Structure 1
Amino acid sequence: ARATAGEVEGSDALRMDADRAEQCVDALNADLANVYVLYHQLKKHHWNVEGAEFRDLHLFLGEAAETAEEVADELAERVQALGGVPHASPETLQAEASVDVEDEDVYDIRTSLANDMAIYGDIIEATREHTELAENLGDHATAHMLREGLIELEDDAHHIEHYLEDDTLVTQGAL
């Protein structure tokens, strides 16, 4: 074994002591778990979405998943850079995630999207707290990275909010 899960050694290269590093790592690993479950659920909805606006949603969800996957990669690599061990196995990621995950059945798109929006909100609030924690610790690179990811997550969260809004070009007439 080269490293033990749960341990945080910090980094000499990045001049980050283990105490300070572990504070960021704990926050980052928690985010990582949630972001990866989000990724998998976005993939699920991407694969299963059907209906009148399925292709646009399919494409949106695919892009949302890609973004979530990139954020997770950033998070995981920052955890590793800070001398920590990023959650890796699917089982570990879900167990460590605090957000709710749909069961294996497929729900209609409005329900599916609403579930995803709930996951985003949770991650969004957490990321805001984590960027402050990082800035407070003087880890400006982590803080900056978190904000860079936060803006992409909020964009997708906002997109879902608009998909669920009570407007449409459809009329009873065209119906």
Structure 2
Amino acid sequence: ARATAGEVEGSDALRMDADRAEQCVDALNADLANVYVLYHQLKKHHWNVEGAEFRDLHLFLGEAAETAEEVADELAERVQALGGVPHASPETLQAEASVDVEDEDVYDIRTSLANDMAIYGDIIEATREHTELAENLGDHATAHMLREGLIELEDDAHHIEHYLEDDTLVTQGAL
């Protein structure tokens, strides 16, 4: 093997010793696994959403899935740049994730979105914590990247909350 899962060597290019790096690496790898389960669940919901608002939600979820994937890509890359090994296989991702994932049945849109919302909220809190860890290790590139992904993820989370709110243009008359 060139590198072993779980090892972190730091980077001589980035002047980050393996001590410091391993702390960011652990945080990032946890985040990577959560965000890729997120990705996969947003894709599920995007594939299956049906009903009166489905096209708008299909588009929003497809976008949300794209932003998770990009976040995952930046996490994994940064793990690798810091001398670590990002979690790669799908069973590894889901094993290492802490967030809850739906079973294989398809649920109605309100249920599915409320499940997503819970994943986002967990990722959001973790990411906040990890940006502080990064800044306190003086890894400002990591901290900045994490915040750049945070703000995207909060925006999608906030979208889902709004989708779920108790207002609508529909009236009992229109029914």
Q: Give the TM-score band, short-chain normalised.
A: over 0.9
Q: Could you tell me how far 1:50 is from its partner in structure 2?
A: 0.1
CA distance in 1, matches of 2:29, 2:98: 11
1:76-125 residue CA offsets vs partner (Å, 9 max, x unmatched)? 00000000000000000000000000000000000000000000000000
CA distance in 2, matches of 1:5, 1:108: 38
Runs of at least 4 residues of structure 1 off by over 3 A? none
CA distance in 1, matches of 2:82, 2:168: 48
Structure 2 unaligned segments of length 5 or more: list them.
none
CA distance in 2, matches of 1:47, 1:101: 16
Q: Could you tell me how far 1:158 is from its partner in structure 2?
A: 0.1
Q: How many residues align?
A: 175
Q: Could you tell me how far 1:46 is from its partner in structure 2?
A: 0.2
Structure 1 unaligned segments of length 5 or more: list them.
none
Identity %: 100
Q: Could you tell me how far 1:13 is from its partner in structure 2?
A: 0.2
Q: Could you tell me how far 1:60 is from its partner in structure 2?
A: 0.1
Q: Could you tell me how far 1:64 is from its partner in structure 2?
A: 0.1
2:84 corresponds to = 84
CA distance in 1, matches of 2:92, 2:6: 12
Q: Could you tell me how far 1:159 is from its partner in structure 2?
A: 0.1
1:1-37 residue CA offsets vs partner (Å, 9 max, x unmatched)? 1000000000000000000000000000000000000
1:75 corresponds to = 75
CA RMSD of aligned residues (A): 0.1
CA distance in 2, matches of 1:91, 1:10: 26
What secondary structure, in the 3-state scheme, does the structure 2 residue paired with 1:121 have?
helix
1:51-87 residue CA offsets vs partner (Å, 9 max, x unmatched)? 0000000000000000000000000000000000000
